[PDB]
Structures are given as C-alpha cells and as structure tokens.
Amino acid sequence: AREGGGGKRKGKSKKWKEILKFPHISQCEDLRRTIDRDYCSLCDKQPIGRLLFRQFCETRPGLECYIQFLDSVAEYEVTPDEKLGEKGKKIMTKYLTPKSPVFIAQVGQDLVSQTEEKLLQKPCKELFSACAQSVHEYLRGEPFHEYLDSMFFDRFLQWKWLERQPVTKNTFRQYRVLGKGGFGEVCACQVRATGKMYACKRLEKKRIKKRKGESMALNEKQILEKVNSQFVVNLAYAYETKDALCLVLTIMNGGDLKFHIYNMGNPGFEEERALFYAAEILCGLEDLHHENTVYRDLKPENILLDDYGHIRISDLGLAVKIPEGDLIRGRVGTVGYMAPEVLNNQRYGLSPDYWGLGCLIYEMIEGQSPFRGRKEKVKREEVDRRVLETEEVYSHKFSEEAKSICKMLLTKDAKQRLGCQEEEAAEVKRHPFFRNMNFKRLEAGMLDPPFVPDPRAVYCKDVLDIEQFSTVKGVNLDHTDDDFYSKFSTGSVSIPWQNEMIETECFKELNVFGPNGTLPPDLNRNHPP
C-alpha cells in the first residue's frame, strides 16, 4: 500500500489484471515439485510468502496467538526507551503468563524466566529476541507443514509462477535520463503492469569489455540481489539488451550526497542533517555487515537521496562478501577515502567501512574531505601520505560530539577504531553524537528527515534502448562474454518483486479467494483450463 514517485505519470496498465492473471493451480506442479520447502525463506524472508503464511495462521486461533506475539514484539522494539518496562510487562502478562487466554505455551518457561529477569533490570530493545526465535522454532514445525498443505501455499505457488515469468520487451516503459557515467547511463523506467517506478542502470557491453569489468559488474549484481536493506539500493530485475546489460534499481532521484554537501555554496550543512544521514548510512552498513560484506567504497557520490530525503548506499561494485572467519586483501577504493589498513595493503575485515563513515561525517559537516581540498592539485601518493601520517583538524563547524565521533572513526589503527570492536555497530550507535537517535525507529521509518530535496533534473536528450533482448549466444568459439551475459540476466529478483506487488496493491487486489466455500476457480482442481 506504500508508494512514492519517480514521477509516475502513468499508473497501472488498464489490463494489469490480465498481465498478472494467476495460472490455474494445475500449471504449478513443476513449481510444487522443485521448490525448497524452507520455513525461513517461504514464511518470513519472502514478503508474499510471509503474508500468506500469516493469512493461514489467522484461520487458526491456536496459531494466531503466535503471530500476535511476534507483532507485539515488533511494537516493543520501537517503543521509547523510557516506556520499555511497561510495554515489556504488558507482553509478559498477555503472552507469557499461562493465566492469559492468548498465552503461548511453546515458549519454554526457562526462556520466560530469563526474560522476566532481564525485564526487572534495565530493559533493552532486544529483550524478546530469544522468545521470538523460540516461536519460529515452533512455527517451522507442524504449523509450517500444515501451511504447505493449504490453499494459502497453493496461492503462494501461483504468485511464484508470476514472479518467475520472463522479463520481455513489454515489461517496462522508459522515462527520462536520470544520470550518466560509469559504464553507461541511468534512466527512469516503470513496470507497465504495476506502475512502479525504478532506475534502470544501463551498462554498455562494449564498455564493460574494454575495461574488463565483467567480474565487477557481476559482483555488484550478486551482492545487490542478496542484500535487502532499506538503506541500500535494491535490485528488482536484471536483464539483457542487444548492446547492454540492465540493472533495475531503487529509484533514488533526490541527488547524491556530493551534490548536497557542495550545493550550499557554503559547503557542509547543519549537524542535524549530517546526524540523520550518518545514522541511516550506519544502518546500511550494519545490513551489509550482517552478510559479512564489506562495502569498501564509502564517499559522498555513492550515497543517494530519494524524494523523501532518506538515503541509500549505492554502487556496490567494490563490495566483497568475506568468507566467515576470514580476512581479505586488496587495495581498492577512491583516493582520499581509503582506510590506512587498505592503503598499507594489509589483511582486513569490515573495518574500512567505519573509516569511511568517519570520512563522510567529517565531509558533511566541514564541507571538505579530511585529507584533501576540493580545489587542490595534489598527487594521489601525497593524499595517501596525509592519510597515513597526518591528523585531520576540526573547525568551529564541529560540535564536541561530532569532533569526537569523527576522531574515533578516523582512528588510523583499525584495532582501536570505533565500531571495530566486539560490539560492532552497537558501539557507534551509543556514541553521544547519536544520543538523541532511536535507531529502531529510524530502521522502521518512523523518523522524518530534516531536509527534503528538490528532485534531480538533468538535461539529456539521449534516450538509449532498454528493451529486453536475449542475444543469440555462442556465435564465436570464445563465448566468455556470452557466458557472462547469461549469468547476469536472471530476470526478476524475488524479494523486491514481491515488495513491488505489495506496495502497488497488486497483491491486495489480486489476492482473493472464494466467498464462503472459499476456493476460487483458479484454485479449483475440478475445472482446469
């Protein structure tokens, strides 16, 4: 039911209900046979799967109490710190006390006792996390298996059938160019059936080939697909055209952070703004780091605003998923934004991203990078020398807390850097610079940005072809490029496609069952087409 524009001038297709018409259930047999029946994926991570599992649970008063609990815990997490004691006590009384009618017995009383004791002490936002996990361990059992046998999972297969339909020349319509650079250009585009607006990043095949950017283009695609964060650009579709590869991404047309820092004419902006952006960037980093993925490229150009003034981390090409327990090596990044441990070509973890966060907070407030001026003629090896050998200084533009968090993130030794300890991001979140920020509310979108941007408008009369075309492969004995094109163009990406259906209310309007006897014709096995 959520929507905002990329400037969506046309709405859904008048024929959208035909385009998105469910297959008869008899056409889902191959899906039924091949689908991995994995509770976490099917009933939680996949948005439509989560919705249909909950619809199933609400038909059973005995399962519905578990869903209510999980929803209460969600409410608890965003409760103001001072009121957690009351909200927690209410949850305890309602769900975790056998006297109550909505009592949930499958949370072990040893877990309840643990929770009751933590609740006596200083309550924290994560108080109920162990209980919640216990609930899912129950639900992934018999309730899940009942779900798989219900009309709600049948309906899930129908949605999955739709999801996996190919991207074609008719899937999108094209709007104006948003920007140009890198391997290509970015233009606005819209899914015809749903009306949802996206950015289409068009990578020219000839430019990828010349610069040998195949592995990086593929890497960006694969990390984008696996990260689902409100603070990282999402990938909804990946496909091929004759001359290009297309990444269909979250449209972020509010302008990049480099533009906004230097648009002022008095570079740098108010601490309240920098605070908000830094908080969202941190959440984005935590989401990547949860996948043990190090970004490595933080800099203002790679942070984009949307029309609401929220931000996302963009440009994942240099990101790397680190194998668990390992460290990685490579000297990559932008000059002036590379951490000392990167410059020194040491083995490193997630730590460079905290250095990057310090660079960003510093630049947002000062209006200049810590180690270089924006108008300066300086060799890269000198910029590198400054980063290694000199300390940054702080003008009157910095509050004590801003100076402090910048110094702690710009700690040259990674071992002592803020955020790089046991606590990881938690240490950064509790810094005085952020003392007034409730990060759970921020994550949940409950905090309004202090600044709303003018939507970006570029003049470009070039409109490049983004119509899907599957090129004939293997024309040459060397088919390495073709292999790459095939690997890249996997079509729709599950979680964003499902969110697109939900946000545009295609799900709400299309997802309907029979009146009382409650089997609709598309689920009725006695009448195949």
Active site residues: 297
**Range in contact with ligand ANP (rule: CB under 6 A) among 189-197, 244-252, 378-386, 462-470:** 244-252
Residue 284 sits in the site that holds ligand ANP (CB under 6 A): no
Residue 178 tokens read as 């948003």
Three-state secondary structure readout of 355-377: HHHHHHHHHHHHCCCCCCCCCCC
* Sign of the Cα pseudo-torsion (40, 46, 51, 52, in order): negative
Whole-angstrom CA distances from 117 to 70, 91, 108 are: 20, 14, 15
Distance in Å, CB of 218 to Mg ion, minimum: 17
311-330 positions binding Mg ion, by CB under 5 A: 315
133-192 positions binding ligand ANP, by CB under 6 A: 178-182, 186
Residue 306 sits in the site that holds Mg ion (CB under 5 A): no
Whole-angstrom CA distances from 322 to 104, 186, 256, 423 are: 39, 29, 28, 19
Query: Of these partners, Mg ion, ligand ANP, none, which one is at the site of residue 250 (CB under 5 to 8 Å by kind)?
Result: ligand ANP
Of 151 and 224, which CB lies nearer to ligand ANP in the complex structure?
Answer: 224
Residue 397 tokens read as 């533009």
DSSP 301-330: GGEEE-TTS-EEE---TT-EEPPTT--B--
Query: Of these partners, ligand ANP, Mg ion, none, which one is at the site of residue 186 (CB under 5 to 8 Å by kind)?
Result: ligand ANP
Of 174 and 470, which CB lies nearer to ligand ANP in the complex structure?
Answer: 174
Residue 297 sits in the site that holds Mg ion (CB under 5 A): no
Residue 301 sits in the site that holds ligand ANP (CB under 6 A): yes
- For β-strands 311-313 and 303-305, DSSP reports them as antiparallel
- For β-strands 184-191 and 172-181, DSSP reports them as antiparallel
CB 163 within 8 A of CB 494: yes
Q: Where are the alpha helices (DSSP H) in 367-435?
A: 380-389, 400-409, 425-429
Residue 252 sits in the site that holds ligand ANP (CB under 6 A): yes
Give backbone dihedrals phi and psi of 41, rounded to 5 degrees, phi first.
Answer: -70, -55
Distance in Å, CB of 182 to ligand ANP, minimum: 3
The count of residues in the chain is: 529
Contact pick of 251, 357, 365, 442 for ligand ANP (by CB under 6 A) = 251
Known binding positions:
178-186, 201
**DSSP at 522:** G
Residue 214 sits in the site that holds Mg ion (CB under 5 A): no
Residue 314 sits in the site that holds ligand ANP (CB under 6 A): yes
Distance in Å, CB of 216 to Mg ion, minimum: 12
Of 315 and 363, which CB lies nearer to Mg ion in the complex structure?
Answer: 315
Residues 6+ apart with CB under 8 A from 164: 31, 491, 492
Of 163 and 315, which CB lies nearer to Mg ion in the complex structure?
Answer: 315
Of 220 and 341, which CB lies nearer to Mg ion in the complex structure?
Answer: 220
Distance in Å, CB of 302 to Mg ion, minimum: 6
Biggest distance spanned by C-alpha atoms of the chain: 77
Pairwise CA distance, residues 105 & 59, whole Å: 19
Residue 54 tokens read as 């909950």
Of 317 and 352, which CB lies nearer to Mg ion in the complex structure?
Answer: 317
Distance in Å, CB of 96 to ligand ANP, minimum: 44
Of 16 and 183, which CB lies nearer to ligand ANP in the complex structure?
Answer: 183
Distance in Å, CB of 5 to Mg ion, minimum: 23
Residue 253 sits in the site that holds ligand ANP (CB under 6 A): yes
Site string for Mg ion, 498-517 (x = CB under 5 A): --------------------
Residue 338 sits in the site that holds ligand ANP (CB under 6 A): no
**Range in contact with Mg ion (rule: CB under 5 A) among 69-77, 309-317, 375-383, 433-441:** 309-317
Of 297 and 443, which CB lies nearer to Mg ion in the complex structure?
Answer: 297
Q: Give which of 320, 304, 200 is closest to 252, Cα–Cα.
A: 304
**Range in contact with ligand ANP (rule: CB under 6 A) among 75-83, 245-253, 283-291, 374-382:** 245-253
DSSP 136-202: HHHHTTHHHHHHHTSHHHHHHHHHHHHHTSPP-TTSEEEEEEEEEETTEEEEEEEETTT--EEEEEE
Q: How many residues at the interface with Mg ion, by CB under 5 A?
A: 1
Which residue has the closest beta carbon to ligand ANP? 181
Contact pick of 77, 214, 225, 256 for ligand ANP (by CB under 6 A) = 256
CB 144 within 8 A of CB 152: no
Residue 250 sits in the site that holds ligand ANP (CB under 6 A): yes
Pairwise CA distance, residues 335 & 72, whole Å: 47
Contact pick of 73, 208, 248, 249 for ligand ANP (by CB under 6 A) = 249
The rounded radius of gyration (Å) of the Cα atoms in the chain is 25
Known binding positions for ATP:
178-186, 201
- For β-strands 255-256 and 244-249, DSSP reports them as unpaired
Q: How many residues at the interface with ligand ANP, by CB under 6 A?
A: 19
Residue 455 sits in the site that holds ligand ANP (CB under 6 A): no
Residue 134 tokens read as 């216990």
Which residue has the closest beta carbon to Mg ion? 315
Distance in Å, CB of 317 to Mg ion, minimum: 8
CB 204 within 8 A of CB 183: yes
Of 101 and 181, which CB lies nearer to Mg ion in the complex structure?
Answer: 181
What is the contact surface with ligand ANP in residues (CB under 6 A)?
178-182, 186, 199, 201, 233, 249-253, 256, 301, 304, 314-315
What is the contact surface with Mg ion in residues (CB under 5 A)?
315
